[PDB]
Design a binder for these strands. Structure first.
Lengths: 67, 67
DNA sequence: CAGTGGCTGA
DNA sequence: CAGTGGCTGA
């Protein structure tokens, strides 16, 4: 498909994303902007899995360094 | 000052990033959430380069399919 | 932002 | 989110 291996791949690079919920993610978000804009509740609603949701939401909110 | 290879490396995985503006980016954003929350005008203020800003914001604002 | 976890070997 | 483009060989 026309799904560029850039932002599309970026989704699967997360510890809570697979090709299965990837299609849902990209269809629910514009790109990286909406991807990181998603909330834990949003994730479960799109991914349909609490584990995948928490894992994805986790990385999105994983601070670079703990001071 | 950990800076795990997860969110930190994620920054350097962009077409408009380097290690020099990486320290600026992480200091201006919490993690991925703020990373994608940045605007093209903001990127220039952080990265200090229009090219890097446009390139970084480009990817952030890159549609999964049909860029 | 808007879609469901969209696949898989013989 | 909050820091400046934070480096580099002899």
């Amino acid at each position: 498909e026309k799904y560029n291996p850039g932002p599309q791949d970026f989704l699967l690079k997360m510890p809570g994303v697979n090709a299965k919920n990837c299609r849902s993610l990209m269809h629910h978000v514009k790109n990286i902007a909406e991807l990181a804009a998603l909330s834990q509740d949003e994730l479960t609603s799109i991914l349909g899995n609490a584990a995948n949701a928490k894992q994805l939401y986790d990385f999105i909110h994983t601070s670079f360094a703990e001071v």
